[PDB]
Design a protein around this ligand. Structure first.
Ligand SMILES: *CC(=O)CCNC(=O)[C@H](O)C(C)(C)CO
Ligand SMILES: *CC(=O)CCNC(=O)[C@H](O)C(C)(C)CO
Lengths: 367, 367
């Protein structure tokens, strides 16, 4: 009864201790930003799965299950394509100042922060080609995460890494969702949706990810349950026109999935992997050479995976395995929270019109 | 142009020179079998992506892009869980008899066949726990493949590896689909569907994969595309009946994706990866610890990726890259054909009732 519903704010921060910060620059040629997910003091077990064919990434080898540093404090998601990876340097600097990183000496101030990053391509979308996130903007983002209270609703839409995100020609952005499992563990996702493929079924106008939604969760946005053939046809025409104008004017989904269920790094790497199936149910096509799709998975380690006295109803792989049963539930939830966070990204967005592109939002076309 | 429609029979053998063979055993305790995809003489460039958390496989390392043997002749999909991998030895023996394999000597008869295989769990579904595919059954499957003409319609349903296959409690089976690209290249999938998760949305009775179907392709199966609340209620209860009876009596999707577009092994390996997204769109949940989901990708290397009129209509990644654009189309097609093949598997199945299980088909419940 207590599972199958969202956590308190239906977002990443429903995983207690997890913090989210956005920093962006809009106007005067700029339409880009950075989003930082910051783990609670002491770090979180982290893993990654880079599945798109055209990634821009940093520090992903350090996250291999074989390797030395198992827990990290921060994950960076950034615009500005590979240049935007510069933002991570500013987050490492802040963490160092905070004394947070892997200890490399006797002096507890001697730490080396392991800061993975992934980037999305938004170059020129504000008008100025070289307007990209830098160290200072990465630092701003992590400082804003540190400044938030625990369990603060995550801000969605055209903010942080989603500031210049575009999804199938429509304005994309930041989206987030959570679910509580029957065990009391929370699983949640945050996504910066910048897909080259479409979040929208081109035959009907329906959001691919919608049917994975929990009851009523999208209502606060106000979108018809039937989409008329005419509404959809006008929408397609508008989008084709914004796309043609965008093109004349011009002369990847990044995600973090988190849970408070205690996962080893290998299990978190499997979670990052199953989250990609949630992405596939929300966007089509995905993971192509032109997509940089990357999922980071975090576990705060606060709840055991399996409760202390299992029922006949506890999930069991092959009828017998309780740990694998409990892990399957987390993995399937990882997919579902990412599908749902994609839909929220698409519904939370508002359109833009700059010298670097015209991108109407889903609601502007269908609401 | 000519793309976005099926090839002549809407199946793997639309990829010219590709052959499919099934051998199975039904009755007297048995409900299992083997399916072999047999490439044309000279072999096919092959790769693999094992994404399920509970695989049973053979000879997957030999298909790494870095390694020695880049082309192979046969891929084996088998029932019988890990025991059923024995079937591949019979296929290797037959290929050696044919002089087909990696040359290991000046003598042309001296070959070592690289025969990758994957297995699906169907133990005891015929009534007898130890009735599993063996080498003779694998040999029968590849002999059956070799005797087929080119372009032969693929047999679907409870045949071959699909003989004992079950998908979310419903009878699973073999399914297949193809699509032609604008280039004239064909991309196709064959799937043996045995998922622990569901091919059906539990709120509507709708097949997850259907909205990826090509218009009209499923019409022959005589299944409504809008399901009444009364039908759905009856179907749920019937399945739950079968499932309880199955449990009393007793008390993974494997796929080959092929194309004639010339691909490098690394390109085919990416294709085996994107195909898994198409599996995600047909089955939920998937890729879990209890799923042994495996995709093998084959290229017959008969048509260049690029034809020769690079119209402002030939796809281009980032507006400029012709080769990456053409590959993107194959990668996206690889996902879609596997989604559609899964639906065909579900629709082609007919139900079973044996001492080891009761598994009604989707059509028996919904049509
Ligand atoms: C999906 C997307 O926005 C592409 C993200 N990747 C990049 O921007 C890379 O740095 C590219 C593909 C431009 C260069 O390797
Ligand atoms: C998806 C499925 O049918 C299971 C395929 N894998 C197996 O049968 C393995 O051999 C198991 C998981 C039983 C043991 O490693």
């Amino acid at each position: 009864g207590i599972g199958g519903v969202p956590g308190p704010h239906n977002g990443l921060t429903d995983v207690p201790g997890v913090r989210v910060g956005h920093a962006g620059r809009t106007g005067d040629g700029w339409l880009t930003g950075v989003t930082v997910v910051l783990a609670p003091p002491g770090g979180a077990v982290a893993a990654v799965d880079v599945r798109g064919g055209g990634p821009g990434t940093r520090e992903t080898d350090a996250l291999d299950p074989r390797n030395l540093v198992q827990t990290i404090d921060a994950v960076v998601l950034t615009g500005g394509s590979a240049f935007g990876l510069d933002a991570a340097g500013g987050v490492a600097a802040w963490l160092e100042e905070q004394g947070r990183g892997f200890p490399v000496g006797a002096d507890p101030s001697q730490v080396v922060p392991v800061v993975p990053a992934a980037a999305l391509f938004d170059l020129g979308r504000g008008g100025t080609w070289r307007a990209r996130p830098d160290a200072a903007l990465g630092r701003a983002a992590v400082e804003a995460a540190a400044a938030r209270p625990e369990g603060d609703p995550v801000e969605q839409g055209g903010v942080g890494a989603g500031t210049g995100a575009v999804v199938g020609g429509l304005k994309g952005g930041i989206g987030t969702a959570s679910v509580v499992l029957d065990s009391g563990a929370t699983v949640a996702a945050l996504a910066a949706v910048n897909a080259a493929g479409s979040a929208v079924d081109p035959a009907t106008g329906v959001l691919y990810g919608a049917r994975t939604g929990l009851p009523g969760e999208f209502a606060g946005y106000g979108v018809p349950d039937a989409i008329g053939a005419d509404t959809h046809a006008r929408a397609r025409a508008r989008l084709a026109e914004a796309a043609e104008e965008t093109a004349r004017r011009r002369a990847t989904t990044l995600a973090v999935v988190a849970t408070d269920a205690t996962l080893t790094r290998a299990q978190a790497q499997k979670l990052a992997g199953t989250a990609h199936d949630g992405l596939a149910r929300a966007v089509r096509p995905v993971h192509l050479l032109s997509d940089g799709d990357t999922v980071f998975a975090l576990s705060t380690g606060r709840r055991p995976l399996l409760p202390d006295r299992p029922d006949a109803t506890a999930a069991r792989a092959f009828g017998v395995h309780l740990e694998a049963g409990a892990l399957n539930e987390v993995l399937a939830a990882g997919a579902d929270v990412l599908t749902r966070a994609v839909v929220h990204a698409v519904l939370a967005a508002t359109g833009v019109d700059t010298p670097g592109g015209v991108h109407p939002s889903y609601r502007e076309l269908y609401a």
